[PDB]
Design an enzyme around this catalytic site. Structure first.
Site, PDB file in Angstrom:
ATOM      1  N   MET A 140      -5.739   1.944   2.506  1.00 17.51           N
ATOM      2  CA  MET A 140      -6.749   2.015   3.550  1.00 17.51           C
ATOM      3  C   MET A 140      -6.486   1.008   4.665  1.00 17.51           C
ATOM      4  O   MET A 140      -6.860   1.248   5.822  1.00 17.51           O
ATOM      5  CB  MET A 140      -8.128   1.861   2.899  1.00 17.51           C
ATOM      6  CG  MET A 140      -9.301   1.921   3.827  1.00 17.51           C
ATOM      7  SD  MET A 140      -9.641   0.353   4.653  1.00 17.51           S
ATOM      8  CE  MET A 140     -10.049  -0.680   3.244  1.00 17.51           C
TER       9      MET A 140
ATOM     10  N   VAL B  43      -4.343   2.814   6.989  1.00  9.65           N
ATOM     11  CA  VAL B  43      -5.146   3.814   7.697  1.00  9.65           C
ATOM     12  C   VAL B  43      -5.877   3.174   8.876  1.00  9.65           C
ATOM     13  O   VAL B  43      -5.908   3.727   9.983  1.00  9.65           O
ATOM     14  CB  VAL B  43      -6.124   4.532   6.751  1.00  9.65           C
ATOM     15  CG1 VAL B  43      -6.909   5.591   7.520  1.00  9.65           C
ATOM     16  CG2 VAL B  43      -5.370   5.187   5.598  1.00  9.65           C
ATOM     17  N   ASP B  44      -6.466   1.998   8.662  1.00 12.87           N
ATOM     18  CA  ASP B  44      -7.203   1.341   9.743  1.00 12.87           C
ATOM     19  C   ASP B  44      -6.313   0.551  10.696  1.00 12.87           C
ATOM     20  O   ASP B  44      -6.842  -0.064  11.626  1.00 12.87           O
ATOM     21  CB  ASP B  44      -8.276   0.403   9.183  1.00 12.87           C
ATOM     22  CG  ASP B  44      -9.401   1.139   8.500  1.00 12.87           C
ATOM     23  OD1 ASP B  44      -9.524   2.363   8.702  1.00 12.87           O
ATOM     24  OD2 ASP B  44     -10.170   0.486   7.771  1.00 12.87           O
ATOM     25  N   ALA B  45      -4.997   0.517  10.468  1.00  8.55           N
ATOM     26  CA  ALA B  45      -4.103  -0.196  11.382  1.00  8.55           C
ATOM     27  C   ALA B  45      -4.334   0.201  12.844  1.00  8.55           C
ATOM     28  O   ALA B  45      -4.770  -0.616  13.661  1.00  8.55           O
ATOM     29  CB  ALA B  45      -2.645   0.057  10.994  1.00  8.55           C
TER      30      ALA B  45
END
Lengths: 57, 77
Positions: B55, B58-60
């Site tokens: 995750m 994913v939030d990078a």
């Protein structure tokens, strides 16, 4: 009649179809749950057919 | 003048697309986590650690988008 020994045997009555008791709890996981590759119900039907026949033989 | 009227619009579009992307990505990942856990709960803490590990990536990008949106809205103005 059980072949208890070469010179001793005994007549017995045993529960066959409705599954008898066992001493365990669920084993959560080992390898793959083949169950839903084919239909679970039909495959279990076939397996229990085999089970009853083997006991009788 | 016209500058601020368009800059609020720019920040709005950037952060809206960032929101959509981040939310639905974690949605997809978490669904498979829950189903696999329902089959065998012994893996829940393990898979939840894996869940944070993935995750993060994913939030990078969406937080690059959110940081630049906040920058446009409060610093370029």
């Amino acid at each position: 009649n059980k072949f208890i020994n070469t010179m001793s045997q005994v007549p017995t009555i045993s529960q066959l179809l409705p599954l008898p008791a066992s001493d365990d709890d669920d084993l959560k996981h080992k390898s793959w749950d083949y169950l839903y590759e084919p239909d679970p119900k039909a495959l279990l039907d076939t397996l229990l057919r085999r089970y009853v026949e083997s006991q009788v033989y | 003048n016209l500058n601020m009227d368009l800059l609020y619009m720019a920040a709005a579009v950037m952060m809206g697309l960032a929101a959509i992307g981040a939310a639905i990505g974690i949605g997809i990942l978490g669904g498979k986590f829950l189903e696999g856990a329902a089959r065998q709960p012994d893996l829940i803490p393990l898979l939840r650690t894996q869940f944070f590990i993935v995750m993060g990536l994913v939030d990078a990008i969406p937080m690059i988008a959110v940081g630049l949106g906040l920058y446009v809205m409060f610093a370029v103005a």
